[PDB]
Write a protein that binds this DNA or RNA. Structure first.
Lengths: 93, 99, 108, 82, 99, 82, 109, 95
DNA sequence: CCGAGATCAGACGATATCGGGCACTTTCAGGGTGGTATGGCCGTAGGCGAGCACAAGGCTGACTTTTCCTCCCCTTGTGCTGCCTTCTGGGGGGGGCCCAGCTCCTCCCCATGCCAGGGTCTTTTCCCCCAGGCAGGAAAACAAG
DNA sequence: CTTGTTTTCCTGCCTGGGGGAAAAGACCCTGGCATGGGGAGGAGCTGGGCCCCCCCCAGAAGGCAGCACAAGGGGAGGAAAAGTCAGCCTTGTGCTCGCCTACGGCCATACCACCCTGAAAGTGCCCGATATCGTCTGATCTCGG
């Protein structure tokens, strides 16, 4: 007997925060977990390539920010960078 | 004499009906029988998950629709509405699948 | 933050900072992973989550439906110009296509 | 399934696929041309997936093998795991 | 009257000349100025390694040469010899730059 | 080098690029379209090269930055390193 | 074959098995790298290099040149069908393009 | 003081060149291109093998993963010959 | 502009199936402590990137002729669409079976980590040969009688 | 079909500049030894993929009428192309400066590793309540007269 992990306990908590009236189907939850798994790999791979290019051995926040800037379109990158910076600033202090 | 639809109207109605739908437009068994035929030349006595054959179907059906969405533009560029094999060949070559 | 609680609550997110950190550490991306990288990633992912869920809920409400299906996600992604650029080579299963007819193929 | 199931993709099915792409009129050779195009693409996918299947020392082709084969070709697929 | 060539033979002569060669067809300085003007919108007081500008020129010329091959095919498909902006738009849309 | 440098890729240069591409005849509106296309492509590549330069905490855009930016968009360039 | 020498000469390769192993180790690909993975890669890369350096040598001999220039490699790559597939999205600096004219754009009778 | 040293495949590319074509040289730009080609296909195969070993939850990259990555990345005859030469190299290194 | 006829749209009864919530657990995240090693900071140097005269000459910008290519209109017949009828086979339910994929326990051969040592790879000189340039000659397409 | 007219290839001579070999060094690969740990292998369980059977009715296949669109042909004009002629701005050379990137040395604090506990979430169970089907009209679109 084994258990699996997914972003289903967390997508359904953002869905009930942004639209607290609509639900979601199992197939939609699977698609929306595949989306998170794809974007995570994209950003992580780009940050890894950046760190390897700059001869660094540590993936900091300034590598994730650069990966986000490279990977997302204009407004998406502008809002994602600000959200990440706010989260980091509140987490640190 | 009975009532008849002029050509083109039924085609547009079918376009509107199939663009608002989501269902699979290829019968499942004839596609599974083709997948289990293509896989034999690569490896024999292969088993196939129903999820795997469904993934193959919903990938091929989005490939073919996306290809016809370019063949239509290739037909319109030639001042046509019928889509011909030359249009498909041009679309594929420009995409890069034929070079 | 001075309060000693979970790292997602400490950052104000709804995504798992701990498991994002574990995935960054065990995915072999670099020899070392900083402490703020999971926080940044679990805030970019949670924003990209709410950017698609909001539009999919809008699409669901536009069709008198109280549940989000793959069709609603596809409609949102393909109708939003930025999300269609991000997921431009992504096939949403059971999503269909946008309703679109060329103006030359309509009766005159 | 051994011989000649490429004709299992009936002409009405190809017409429906064309209609979903906005096509109003279809010639009489699009069907054969599309069957060829369909086979060429399926041959690539059900080869890149069987490669994973024999790398895992398995005889069943799981949905993850197909998903990875599609992802490696640039055609990422959402909904079937991953 | 003096000797004059028929329209369309110097075009093929130029095609063969510029296909047999490997030189760069855009003059270096006007492209360098273009690159420097473009990069200022992103960040001011930007220095360029000469190899970086040369790499940008080679990539841009390769891009344009490859795009004109897709444009000529569209122009031949439309039963034409002359390429027009609609051909470039169709080629870019199909290859995936305009969607 | 501040204003109106796109009119440096002159009509003869665009004609030579098309001649190398196999184009036998050119319409007179092709040049103002090829200029927009080149500007868009360069604005896409330099936007990533400058991002790499800023991340490296540098003030000079390097051939490695350009090569990595080109590689990112599936336009790998051989010759300048990497 | 059993020897106490360089691992490249132990396997019969002209490519550095040690360097390939080090690049795999410090490349963040996997925690562990087996003993036969650098030997396999140092032979795949050597075979591909030999293929291209033979086709480009043939192209250079077809142009009466003793030296290999980027144009020769471009000609070899774009004239080999199975190499053009491997390098379909690759630009060769100062490589030029394959000479070709469409049948429509030619003089008639 | 000293300048940091750089590394490249320009010692082995030339060795293979003098084996397949004894009398022809190679220019500096061509050697630079052949240096990026080897790095490119090294990175491609290494990344494919890494993802391959991650899919089956393996921590070791092996000749099996390299062979499967070669079979997944190269066209038909290229993959056939590369796999055969790699198998021969591994067999000779072990025997 | 006029009237039929087909087709889509809205709405209410209802029925099942699937989303959503509650409890057990079990397994992974978090707190505390140690240790070290990577990255930040200061200082130095010089390499290379930027800026400026100065040709000259090759390249670009503009005007003329005109030819031929694009564009439009006409007409035909052919191939495509639309509807009807037949019949087949895909979809669905129900059952049986055996193989293959997942899990667990042993341990053992393989990969890793660290030190000593040299042999292979890197950088600087240099020179001689191959490639570039150029002038004169022959050949080869090209177009107008 | 010829002759005249440009453009291109060929060949010999001159030259220069860059590639291949040699020399010194330094740095990383290899050999040796000790150690943990992942995976190879042998069982076991059981989930699911395969095979079979029976039924139906929904959809594909063939055909017929007929019509509208692809395609060939003719005419018109306008707009690129080819060829001169004038100027300009690119490029190559040379000279100057200083700014920025890379290297070296030092250290401090941030991240890995390890030890435990608890709480988050993963799974299973259950219930209700929304999406769909079905029938009935109502509105709208299409096409002949």
């Amino acid at each position: 007997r084994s258990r699996k992990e997914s972003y289903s306990v967390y997508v359904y908590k953002v869905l009930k925060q942004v639209h607290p009236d609509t639900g979601i189907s199992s197939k939609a939850m699977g698609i929306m977990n595949s989306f998170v798994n794809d974007i995570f790999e994209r950003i992580a791979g780009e940050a890894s390539r950046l760190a390897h290019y700059n001869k660094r051995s540590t993936i900091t926040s300034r590598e994730i920010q650069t990966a986000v800037r490279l990977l997302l379109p204009g407004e998406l990158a502008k809002h994602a960078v600000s959200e990440g910076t706010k989260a980091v600033t509140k987490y640190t202090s | 004499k009975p009532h008849r639809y002029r050509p083109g109207t039924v085609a547009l109605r079918e376009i509107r009906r199939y663009q608002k739908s989501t269902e699979l437009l290829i019968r499942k068994l004839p596609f599974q029988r083709l997948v289990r035929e293509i896989a034999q030349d690569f490896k024999t006595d292969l088993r196939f998950q129903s999820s795997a054959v469904m993934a193959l179907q919903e990938a091929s059906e989005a490939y073919l629709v996306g290809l016809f969405e370019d063949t239509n533009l290739c037909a319109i560029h030639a001042k046509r509405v019928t889509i011909m094999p030359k249009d498909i060949q041009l679309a594929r070559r420009i995409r890069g699948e034929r070079a | 933050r001075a309060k000693a609680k979970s790292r997602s609550s400490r950052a104000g997110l709804q995504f798992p900072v701990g498991r994002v950190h574990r995935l960054l550490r065990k995915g072999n991306y670099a020899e070392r992973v900083g402490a703020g990288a999971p926080v940044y990633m679990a805030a970019v992912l949670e924003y990209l989550t709410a950017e698609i869920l909001e539009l999919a809920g809008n699409a669901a409400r536009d069709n008198k439906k109280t549940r989000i299906i793959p069709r609603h996600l596809q409609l949102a992604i393909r109708n939003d110009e930025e999300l269609n650029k991000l997921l431009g080579k992504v096939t949403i299963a059971q999503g269909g296509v946008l309703p679109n007819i060329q103006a030359v193929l309509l009766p005159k | 399934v051994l011989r000649d199931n490429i004709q299992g993709i009936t002409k009405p099915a190809i017409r429906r696929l064309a209609r979903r792409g906005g096509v109003k009129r279809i010639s009489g050779l699009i069907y054969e041309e599309t069957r060829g195009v369909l086979k060429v693409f399926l041959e690539n996918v059900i080869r890149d997936a069987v490669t994973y299947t024999e790398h895992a020392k398995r005889k069943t082709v799981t949905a993850m093998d197909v998903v990875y084969a599609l992802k490696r070709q640039g055609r990422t697929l959402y909904g079937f795991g991953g």
